[model samples]
Target: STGSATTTPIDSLDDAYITPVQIGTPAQTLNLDFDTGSSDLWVFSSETTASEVDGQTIYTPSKSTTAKLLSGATWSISYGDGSSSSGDVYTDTVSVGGLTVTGQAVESAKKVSSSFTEDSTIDGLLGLAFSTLNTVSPTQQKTFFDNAKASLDSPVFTADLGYHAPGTYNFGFIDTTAYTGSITYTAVSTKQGFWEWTSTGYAVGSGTFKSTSIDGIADTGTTLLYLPATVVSAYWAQVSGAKSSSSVGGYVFPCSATLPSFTFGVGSARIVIPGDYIDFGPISTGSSSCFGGIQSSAGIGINIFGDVALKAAFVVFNGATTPTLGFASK
Candidate 1:
């Protein structure tokens, strides 16, 4: 069996992608960010502090007859950005697309960082990374995809993302019609519970593709792309006055500058991020400075092929025995 869901970009910069998920016996639907970068299906809930609730849709476990608390189990997760959430766990029926898994571990947040509380467009995150990254205490739990894999026709899921548009996440099988070219499958490292893979190299616009191994993960949860300083510098060098700025933050350029496209190498395949996508819109209202979708990972010490790059193609997070990743131009 297979499942599918439409993921809509939450904002102009394609900040985050949100997909609707149904939980519990009564089937309460909440929009969750399908994040491949992390592995905890945590949500804002009835237990969350009212002051931190803001406009989020809270999941009320008490109202679901099938909900059962995982006694003694708790979960806490913090992002690289410093935003964090912690809570207890519950097992309830959860559904995505058309697939349903009973007794899916759902972490209900009791404490949330201010950033999460203020983001009204997202109520929670459905982690798509390896179950090993699940933060539940005493006994770790599996992700929705990991639990649903046994029942799926194929042990795989796909991320078909877009720019300023809606995308699709398909579980179990690849949507052949979603991509333009043949799929390029590459070996994955599966290190530290991440879908780790190495890109052969990259090219700027129509220029030559510099051949060097760039290690990273395909993270749909992250908004911007981060690469080695060498690559980031090479890409930004093409833009006039597109330099690092602490004022506007990260690499910024004039809103009116013409930007060359960014292209990254896969296994003999190349995915191109349009110049429009990297502009990332203006930094502030009526401001000429604009943020870049691609940034330097020198500080982070790790490269990330985040949404900034994923939006350029269709990607498959293959969870089969081989655990390879498939990429295709869309």
Candidate 2:
């Protein structure tokens, strides 16, 4: 079976994208963030305390006749940014983009950290990462993609993200119309439950392509592009007035400066990110100071090719055989 869904930006922040999903027998719709960085499908639910619910919508299992509690099962999750959520488990029918998976493990949140409680727009997270990273007590759970792949025409999904706009996420089939040029395929290492790969080298606009290998992940959940401190500093050095700001966090520069284009090597093919994309809007509501989208991954051990980088190209997350990544110009 094949299916497709449209993704829309959350707000002006452009931090995350959300898609509509249906759950249970009668089908209750919820807008969920399709995060490829983490596993475990979780949502704010009836189990959550009333005071902690805030303005977010909650999923009530009791309302669905198809919902079945997973006796004694529990789950907890934390993100790289320190945001977290945890709760009990239930088995139910979960549907997305017309594809349905029966008896899917749906984690219902009983408690959430301040980060999640304050984000009122997103009701839950639909994990697209490898199932090995799923967080469930007693037994591990498989993601919706993993459980649905069996009925799919091919074990694959494509993430076509947009810049300040809407995009599409196709399942089981590739939509050639979504991208231009031939797709460059690269081997991916799933040992860490991520779409992890290596870049052969990189360079700034019109600069020499250095032969420096960098290991990184293609994460849709993260908002900015994170690289090594040296790489980040090298790029900022070219910007006349750029400086690392503790107050604004990360590198900051004048919003009027003409930034240089950035490129990263994927085998022999090079993915180029435009300079305009590097400027991550203004730092404050009414300020001319802007923050760089490309930042240092000093504490975060791995480099992240977040939405800022992934939105520049069409990405295919292939789950067939050894699992490979295919990239092409949008």
- Candidate 1 has which clashing residue pairs, if any? none
- Reference-based TM-score of each model: 0.99, 0.96
CA lDDT scores, all candidates in order:
0.91, 0.90
Q: Clashing residue pairs in candidate 2, if any?
A: none
Instruction: State how far residue 266 of model 1 sits from its true place (Å).
Output: 0.8
lDDT of 2 by residue, 128-229 (tens): 999999999989999999999989999999999888898888899989888888889998999999999988888988799988988999999998899999
Give the runs in model 2 whose Cα sits over 4 Å from its true position: none
lDDT of 2: 0.90
Question: Residues 106-189, candidate 1, lDDT per residue (tens digit)?
Answer: 999999999999899999999999999999998999999999998999999999988999999999998999999898999888
